[PDB]
Structure 1
Amino acid sequence: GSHMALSLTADQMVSALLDAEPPILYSEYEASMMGLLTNLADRELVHMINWAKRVPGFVDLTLHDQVHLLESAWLEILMIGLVWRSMEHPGKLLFAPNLLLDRNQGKSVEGMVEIFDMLLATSSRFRMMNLQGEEFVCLKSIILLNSGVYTEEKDHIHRVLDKITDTLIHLMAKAGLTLQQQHQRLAQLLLILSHIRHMSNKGMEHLYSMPSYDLLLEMLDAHRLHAP
């Protein structure tokens, strides 16, 4: 059977997202650091396509719409994944369990330190808020559906986004927060998403100064040929 996105209960949504989670990858072991970080990003992207196809409502969109969303969100998704992993490592970014880099290691590449500092600050914010795994998967799905939303069909994305918000609220209510604390926590998290967008924009600026629609269209389509 197949659950349509808008029929999922909060528990079914959490179960589907937890099941969709990509694995934690290892680094293949200043030019060497950039090479290792690009290779890791390339490998995470293959898993990100598999994950996006399992995000409720994503497959309901046309292939062209799926590509637009992934093209706009891929760096924000890699970054939220990085900051989540790095939570328990103050002052460091856990790119991989065998690639834990300090702030000073980022200074070896020009313009990279400002991005590393913003990522560290986001990781510190999630740590202080005690972000839960179930909340993290909801936020990452929201980035996917929201980042390219304003760039019937549009109503469907917004209704799926409402379902994910209901899921975040349900998690917070079960965790013991009052209705007021639920709204404050949801707002805090969504405001952090605007900083994640900021980081991706600064990241993309750096990339273009030295992962296209075409590459993503081919990878999203090639997924149909993978074994079940």
Structure 2
Amino acid sequence: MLSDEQMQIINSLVEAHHKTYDDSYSDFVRFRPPVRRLSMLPHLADLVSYSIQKVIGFAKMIPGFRDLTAEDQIALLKSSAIEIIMLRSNQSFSLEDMSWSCGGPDFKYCINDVTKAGHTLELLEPLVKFQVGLKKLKLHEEEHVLLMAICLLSPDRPGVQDHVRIEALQDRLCDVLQAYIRIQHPGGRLLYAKMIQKLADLRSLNEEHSKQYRSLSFQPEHSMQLTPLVLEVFGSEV
């Protein structure tokens, strides 16, 4: 049985996701329009910036992340944001389309659109495989949500200070994820290992993205298209 606190942790983490995820994608109509050189970098940088904002609102509703010192909350978001975006993007991603489908065809980002935002296939190959490998895992929303809060609260991120407190949080979440898949996911004796594997998958997608981010940001004619928030979160600040 799931305890009373671990069930509130589930209810509260799902609430957080439902507040910061818009299944209508209606706020997309206010990004810089896409183009299909880097015709897609402005609309896509807007999408990343939009996402970063939603990731911060998720994190602030995670139990006890609000309680962590502001330095810790920055360092966690600074190093985990791109993983949590890649993680949340699965919701729009479609196995059939092999593309994130965010409304109409104007927000159907296939693989070509992404190469036209400065990113090479060395990031795009592992990312599409991540998306379908996570998709095919047919996760319950209570596991997708939980996995996100777990990737966030990792102490093994550069420049965190109270390892023992954010580890105390993440473990408590890992406990909730494992008991959920046992008690609640019919067939998931293998699943919690599958999910924890996606976490290691992420960190390697993070490495490639943040390496290809340096390529774009060292070109001022490209960094010109980014947004104040992107430049702040993916910047190398301390």
Code of the aligned partner of 1:38: A
1-side partners of 2:116 and 2:57: how far apart? Answer: 34
1:79-135 superposed Cα distances (whole Å, 9 cap, x missing partner): 1111232145442133x3241122234344554333232222112112222112110
Specify every segment of 5 or more residues in structure 2 that has no aligned partner in the other structure, as ranges.
217-227, 234-238
1:116 match: 124
Where 1:146 maps in the other structure, the secondary structure is coil
Q: CA deviation at 1:150?
A: 5.8
2:108 match: 100
> CA distance change for structure 1 residues 213 and 97 in 2, over 3 Å: closer, same or farther?
closer
Where 1:194 maps in the other structure, the secondary structure is helix
2-side partners of 1:199 and 1:89: how far apart? Answer: 23
1:13-50 superposed Cα distances (whole Å, 9 cap, x missing partner): 11111111112342535533111000111122222222
Pick aligned residue for 1:66 from 55, 61, 73: 73
Q: TM-score, normalised by structure 1?
A: 0.78
Q: CA deviation at 1:156?
A: 1.9
1:138 match: 146
Specify every segment of 5 or more residues in structure 1 that has no aligned partner in the other structure, as ranges.
1-6, 217-228
Code of the aligned partner of 1:23: Y
2:200 match: 194
Q: Which moved more, 1:138-147 or 1:23-32?
A: 23-32
* 1:163 matches 2:172: yes
Contact 2:79 2:157 in 1 (8 A): no
1:48 match: 55
Where 1:32 maps in the other structure, the secondary structure is coil
Q: TM-score, normalised by structure 2?
A: 0.75
Code of the aligned partner of 1:171: Y
Where 2:108 maps in the other structure, the secondary structure is strand
2:220 match: none
Where 1:58 maps in the other structure, the secondary structure is coil
2-side partners of 1:188 and 1:138: how far apart? Answer: 14
1:222 match: none
Where 2:40 maps in the other structure, the secondary structure is helix
* 1:128 matches 2:126: no
RMSD: 2.7
1-side partners of 2:176 and 2:48: how far apart? Answer: 29
- Number of residue pairs matched by the alignment: 206
1:225 match: none
Code of the aligned partner of 2:141: G
Q: Percent identity?
A: 22
